[PDB]
Structure formats: structure tokens, C-alpha cells
Design a protein around this ligand. Sequence first.
Ligand SMILES: N=C(N)N[C@@H]1Cc2ccccc2[C@H]1NC(=O)C(=O)Nc1ccc(Cl)c(F)c1
Ligand SMILES: *[C@@H]1O[C@H](CO)[C@@H](O)[C@H](O)[C@H]1NC(C)=O
Ligand SMILES: *[C@@H]1O[C@H](CO)[C@@H](O)[C@H](O)[C@H]1NC(C)=O
Ligand SMILES: *[C@@H]1O[C@H](CO)[C@@H](O)[C@H](O)[C@H]1NC(C)=O
Ligand SMILES: *[C@@H]1O[C@H](CO)[C@@H](O)[C@H](O)[C@H]1NC(C)=O
Ligand SMILES: *[C@@H]1O[C@H](CO)[C@@H](O)[C@H](O)[C@H]1NC(C)=O
Ligand SMILES: *[C@@H]1O[C@H](CO)[C@@H](O)[C@H](O)[C@H]1NC(C)=O
Ligand SMILES: *[C@@H]1O[C@H](CO)[C@@H](O)[C@H](O)[C@H]1NC(C)=O
Ligand SMILES: *[C@@H]1O[C@H](CO)[C@@H](O)[C@H](O)[C@H]1NC(C)=O
Ligand SMILES: *[C@@H]1O[C@H](CO)[C@@H](O)[C@H](O)[C@H]1NC(C)=O
Ligand SMILES: *[C@@H]1O[C@H](CO)[C@@H](O)[C@H](O)[C@H]1NC(C)=O
Ligand SMILES: *[C@@H]1O[C@H](CO)[C@@H](O)[C@H](O)[C@H]1NC(C)=O
Length: 339
Amino acid sequence: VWKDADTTLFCASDAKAHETEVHNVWATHACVPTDPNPQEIHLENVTENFNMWKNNMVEQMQEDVISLWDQSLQPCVKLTGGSVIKQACPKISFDPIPIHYCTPAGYVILKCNDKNFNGTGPCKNVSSVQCTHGIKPVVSTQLLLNGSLAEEEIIIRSENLTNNAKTIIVHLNKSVEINCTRPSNGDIRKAYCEINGTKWNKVLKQVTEKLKEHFNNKTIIFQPPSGGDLEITMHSFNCRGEFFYCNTTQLFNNTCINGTITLPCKIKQIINMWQGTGQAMYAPPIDGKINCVSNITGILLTRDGGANNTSNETFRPGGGNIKDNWRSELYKYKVVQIE
Ligand SMILES: N=C(N)N[C@@H]1Cc2ccccc2[C@H]1NC(=O)C(=O)Nc1ccc(Cl)c(F)c1
Ligand SMILES: *[C@@H]1O[C@H](CO)[C@@H](O)[C@H](O)[C@H]1NC(C)=O
Ligand SMILES: *[C@@H]1O[C@H](CO)[C@@H](O)[C@H](O)[C@H]1NC(C)=O
Ligand SMILES: *[C@@H]1O[C@H](CO)[C@@H](O)[C@H](O)[C@H]1NC(C)=O
Ligand SMILES: *[C@@H]1O[C@H](CO)[C@@H](O)[C@H](O)[C@H]1NC(C)=O
Ligand SMILES: *[C@@H]1O[C@H](CO)[C@@H](O)[C@H](O)[C@H]1NC(C)=O
Ligand SMILES: *[C@@H]1O[C@H](CO)[C@@H](O)[C@H](O)[C@H]1NC(C)=O
Ligand SMILES: *[C@@H]1O[C@H](CO)[C@@H](O)[C@H](O)[C@H]1NC(C)=O
Ligand SMILES: *[C@@H]1O[C@H](CO)[C@@H](O)[C@H](O)[C@H]1NC(C)=O
Ligand SMILES: *[C@@H]1O[C@H](CO)[C@@H](O)[C@H](O)[C@H]1NC(C)=O
Ligand SMILES: *[C@@H]1O[C@H](CO)[C@@H](O)[C@H](O)[C@H]1NC(C)=O
Ligand SMILES: *[C@@H]1O[C@H](CO)[C@@H](O)[C@H](O)[C@H]1NC(C)=O
């Protein structure tokens, strides 16, 4: 017998104590080693309700990642409420590692194993676990990187699809590689990303067909974002400590929906902090080749309003709430207290 409850979670990881990489350092001091033989119990005849959009596990992960970045990735100047903070901004070793979230005694984590679970409502195939799977704390907008893939069909997630103000999370069932590079040898902030156009356009066509099922077979249209902060209008992410901002106009070009697509990118020092603490200037990029190859496993979308009297629905890449990134991985888990 159990009931829905929130409690203090702890973390587990396979971090190395001898690593200078910042995720390793944080996890060494903030997490315990992983269980080599974890137990999972599949529950029979058990129906449980989940709600990925109201899940305290997400708030707790957010607190961890904020703490990690605060101790690791420090900007040269910080612009809060008018209180300017100047500090050292050393270049670091940066590469996210999987973090597991675990319940203490008296509690357990229920896991939804339904193949086409959208994140809310009843789940039929439920199991109980001690810890989540390993989740990499990848901070990004527009595209979700290095995550897990949907097991069967592409999944559309939203707290309320009818509400255009609510962010849509697209969970891909097939990853697409994105290859981003700041070449060695001169604009030190000029970079680019390479993507297989045949792979991407095929996947995007499938996303269109899935969106049709949720929007009464209306015509599905992709468009680049219309105004807003750079973090939202561009695909922003962190590669080896450096903030990349990439133009994704070529990715959301309803025309193609086959060669190599090259997105123009820029390394930015002055950014709007995802933590929500204002503007900050980080250190200039390191020398040499800066490269990150990532799997696109999800897309963050925002639907246009004002289209109720037409046969079209328009979607633009979005983001800005990093909690949605954690939701995209934590959707199938909830904490319950054992009586
Ligand atoms: N939606 C907006 N225009 N701003 C939102 C609004 C809001 C509310 C609460 C906390 C934050 C934020 C803003 N979000 C950000 O500044 C942001 O996500 N920045 C950012 C910077 C770097 C990278 Cl690599 C990245 F992935 C994201
Ligand atoms: C529930 O579990 C059974 C047995 O593994 C599986 O055949 C079925 O597809 C599952 N149902 C859903 C909704 O995934
Ligand atoms: C990239 O995608 C491939 C294919 O799914 C996967 O095997 C690999 O682990 C992914 N790399 C990651 C998660 O960084
Ligand atoms: C991904 O899901 C779609 C349905 O949304 C399905 O048609 C397609 O076969 C799936 N792709 C893979 C690789 O399983
Ligand atoms: C998810 O499933 C629930 C229960 O069937 C349903 O009410 C809701 O509309 C679904 N959400 C999405 C995004 O399809
Ligand atoms: C979903 O959004 C629509 C449009 O804003 C709203 O009318 C409706 O009440 C919402 N549904 C729920 C269950 O909140
Ligand atoms: C990434 O792109 C560069 C050229 O831009 C190439 O040398 C490298 O092999 C690519 N990496 C992968 C994994 O394809
Ligand atoms: C791009 O992806 C397709 C599959 O969609 C693959 O057959 C092709 O080899 C890829 N192109 C390159 C240059 O690797
Ligand atoms: C979309 O089209 C299919 C047939 O191609 C139909 O079965 C389905 O009901 C349609 N969905 C709608 C109209 O919402
Ligand atoms: C992205 O590139 C396109 C094509 O050059 C340009 O029209 C658009 O303004 C760019 N978007 C942003 C947000 O810079
Ligand atoms: C859309 O793709 C086509 C490919 O022929 C290109 O000509 C056009 O300029 C693209 N539009 C963009 C990138 O906004
Ligand atoms: C995604 O994972 C790969 C493999 O670990 C890594 O090399 C790459 O830097 C990651 N991308 C991001 C944005 O963290």
C-alpha cells in the first residue's frame, strides 16, 4: 500500500574522483556510487496516475543542476538586480555525465512502462524501482540533446495541447546526429553545425504525421521563431564549457518536408542565464578545435495562436524553461510513500 508523496531525493553516479571534469567533481562530492545490481519489480494489476507536468522530481533535478553550474561554470561578470559581481572565470573541463535520482527508505519510485505513454493519465504497466535511469543534465533550447529515445512511436507531450501557451515536447524514436564545430585555424566565435538532411527531413515528416493525429488531421506547418531572446530564437547549448548559438532556419523549412545541412553558429559570452538570474558575461573560447557531436532525441515546440478558423497549425522551435528538459526524461517516474 502506497500514496503519492514528495521527499528528499539523493543522487547516484559513476563519477571518477580523479577527474577534473566538473560534472565528475560535483557528483563525487554530492552523489553516491550506483548500485551494480539494481532491482526492478513489475507490478501486476496495478493502475497508477502520472503527471509529468506536476512532478517534484523535476524541481529537485533543477536545483542540482543549478548548484552544479554555480560551482563550476562561473561568468566573469554577473548582472542580477543591479548588483554587479566581478569574479574569476577560469576555463574548465565540461562534459555531462548520467545522474540517477533515488528514494530514501520508506519511499519508492514508480515507473510507467506503457509504450506510448504521453506523460499524463493512467499507466497500466507499472514497475517499482529504487533509482531512475542515468540522466545527463544537458542544458539546451529548441533541440533536446543526448537524451533517451521513445521505444515505439514518436510521442507528443503537453500539459494542454489546446492551450497554445503550453510548450510541446516531441519525443523522437530515432535520433539524428548534430555535428558542431568551432574550427582551429580568424573569427574565434564563428562556428557551425552539420546535420544529415536526409535523416532530419525524414524524421520531421514523421513528426508532422504524428502531430496530425493530435490536431484533427489539420495541415502541419513549421516556421522559424518570430522574435524573442536569442536563447529562444536559436538552438543554444553548451559544448565543452562554451555557449553555442545556432541558426535553425534550415531545419524548420517546410519545403523539404537531402544533402548535408550546415547551420551557422556563434559562440557567445554574453547570455541570458537559464537559471533565471539575469544577464552574465562568460570567458572567451579556448584555442584549438572545439567539437561536440550530439544525438537529437527531442524537440521543443510552440504552436501559433489565432489559427482556429483555418485548416493550418503552425509550430516553431522554442524552449527557455530548462525544467522541460528534465521533464523529457523524468516523465515516466513518480515518488510514492510506502505505508
Ligand atoms: N523565454 C525567454 N525568453 N526567457 C526565459 C524566461 C525565463 C524564466 C525563468 C528562468 C529563465 C528564463 C528565460 N530563459 C533563459 O534565459 C534561457 O533558457 N537561457 C539559456 C542560456 C544558455 C543556454 Cl545553453 C540555454 F540552453 C538557455
Ligand atoms: C503492457 O505490458 C505488456 C507485457 O509486456 C505489453 O505486451 C503491452 O504492450 C504493454 N502495454 C502498453 C500500453 O505498453
Ligand atoms: C547516439 O545515438 C546512438 C543511436 O541511438 C546511441 O547508440 C548513442 O548512445 C548515442 N550517443 C549518445 C547518447 O551520446
Ligand atoms: C517512429 O514512430 C513512428 C510513428 O510516430 C513510426 O511510424 C516509425 O516506424 C518509428 N520509427 C522507428 C525507427 O521505429
Ligand atoms: C495523454 O493521455 C491522457 C489520458 O488518455 C489524455 O487525457 C491526454 O489528452 C493525452 N495527452 C496528449 C498530449 O495526448
Ligand atoms: C486547455 O486549454 C484550453 C485553451 O486555453 C482551455 O480552454 C482548457 O480549459 C484547458 N484544459 C484544461 C483541462 O485546463
Ligand atoms: C564532425 O564533423 C567534422 C567536420 O566538420 C568531421 O571531421 C567529423 O568526422 C564529424 N564527426 C562525426 C562523428 O561525424
Ligand atoms: C545520411 O542519411 C542517410 C539515411 O537517411 C544515409 O543513407 C546516408 O549515408 C547519410 N549520408 C551521409 C553523408 O552519411
Ligand atoms: C486522419 O485521416 C485518417 C485516414 O487517412 C482517418 O482515419 C483519421 O480519422 C483522420 N483523423 C482525423 C480526421 O482527425
Ligand atoms: C537565421 O538565418 C536566416 C537566413 O539567413 C535569417 O533570415 C534569420 O534572421 C536568422 N535567424 C536568427 C534568429 O538570427
Ligand atoms: C528552404 O530550403 C530551400 C532548399 O532549396 C532553400 O532554397 C531555401 O532558401 C530555404 N529557406 C530557408 C533556409 O529559409
Ligand atoms: C552528447 O554526448 C556526446 C557523447 O558523450 C558528447 O561528446 C557531446 O559533447 C554531448 N553533447 C552535449 C551538448 O553535451
